[PDB]
């Protein structure tokens, strides 16, 4: 039956990181008593923790952003290729965002380049879609949600085609539609380009904020 | 075969930076418009 | 930035015993979290202990859990590794490493500081 103590606490860590929060600590040691034929232990704990504090931020790397809006389908040094079967280039590009304090430069190429026919503002005949898929009942948590589907006149799309093959180093080139064309059709209920209709939506939950919920 | 290519005035030079230096804010429109060029001239060529 | 010297490598029979030990620099040694490795021949290095800068947190692969053991002198700038029961594919050269560890009671798996190794060989 020999009570047991703690000793001298030893030296501070120095703190380990050169950013941010770290932690150090203190080692002590049961060594002076000594708990002997029983006892207790020492009573507490060996090892104190405190966190230390270097007041300098961190290297955030930098993000790309969404990419921008695709540059029209014309030809530099020309005119216009709408409405021909003449397929073209067109760039979009990127901004890297939030590199902070010598972080990591954004990976990958700023710029995109695809290939592309032009029917900006083109007399396209078109068709009558089928009812598309109920949207999302809107507003949610507001007052009478309610869903929304449509039908919209179609542009029949002209039978270009899809796979363009250039010489050069022979490459060949997947070229998709661009523009806002101008579909035409018959009217269907007193309208030419969408018509749509609305349900509400039935046993509508109320919204509880999820830290509201917890607590 | 020992040719060699002479820098005069008819000559032209320009640095095209490397892709870290493109994230600049600066060199951000210009390596875009020297690689759109770039798949221009190995695409399209001249129209005159 | 740290240097790490291993001790206490050698010849065993099958079932012996061998106690290792790690020095590791002493202005930056309570910063680091250590760990013990080894590379068999023939073989990709692999994880045997790990211990935090405290000494209270300890993590061991399966293969040696129960046999070996790692602690930690905070006193005298060394890490030990003691190994009971050796089987002859214990045989390896064993690394002592030492990693950032922000915390003092995490143990970590992934480091970036190592040593030249000590040779640890178990004859049947
Ligand atoms: C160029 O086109 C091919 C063909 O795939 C797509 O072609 C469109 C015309 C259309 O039919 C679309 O539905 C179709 O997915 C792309 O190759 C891959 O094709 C398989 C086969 O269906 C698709 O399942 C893949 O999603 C598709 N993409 C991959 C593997 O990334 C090709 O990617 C596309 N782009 C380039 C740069 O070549
Ligand atoms: C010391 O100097 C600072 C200026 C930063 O460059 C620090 O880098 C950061 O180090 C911590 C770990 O030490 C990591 O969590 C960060 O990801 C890293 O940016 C440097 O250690
Ligand atoms: C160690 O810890 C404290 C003093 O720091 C007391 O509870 C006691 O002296 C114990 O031995
Ligand atoms: C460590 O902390 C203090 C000295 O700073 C005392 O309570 C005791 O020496 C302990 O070991
Ligand atoms: C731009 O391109 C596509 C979306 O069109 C995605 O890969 C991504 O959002 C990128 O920013
Ligand atoms: C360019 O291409 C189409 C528009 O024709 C869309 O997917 C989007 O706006 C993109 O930026
Ligand atoms: C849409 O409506 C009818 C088909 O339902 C037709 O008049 C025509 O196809 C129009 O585009
Ligand atoms: C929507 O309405 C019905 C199906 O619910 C059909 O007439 C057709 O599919 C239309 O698109
Ligand atoms: C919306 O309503 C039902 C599904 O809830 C189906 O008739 C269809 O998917 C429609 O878009
Ligand atoms: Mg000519």
Redesign the interface.
Known sequence: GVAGGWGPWGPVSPCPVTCGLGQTMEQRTCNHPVPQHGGPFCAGDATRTHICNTAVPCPVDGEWDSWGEWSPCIRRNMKSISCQEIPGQQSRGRTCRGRKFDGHRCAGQQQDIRHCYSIQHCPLKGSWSEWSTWGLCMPPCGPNPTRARQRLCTPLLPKYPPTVSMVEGQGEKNVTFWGRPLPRCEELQGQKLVVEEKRPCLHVPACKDPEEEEL | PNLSYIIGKDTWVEHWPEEDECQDEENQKQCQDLGAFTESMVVFGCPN | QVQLVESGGGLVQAGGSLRLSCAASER?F???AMGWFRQAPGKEREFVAAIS????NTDYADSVKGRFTISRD??KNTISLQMNSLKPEDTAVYYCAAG??????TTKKEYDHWGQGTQVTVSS
């Open positions: 930056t309570t910063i680091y800068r405290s000494g209270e905070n006193n950032r560890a922000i915390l003092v009671h």
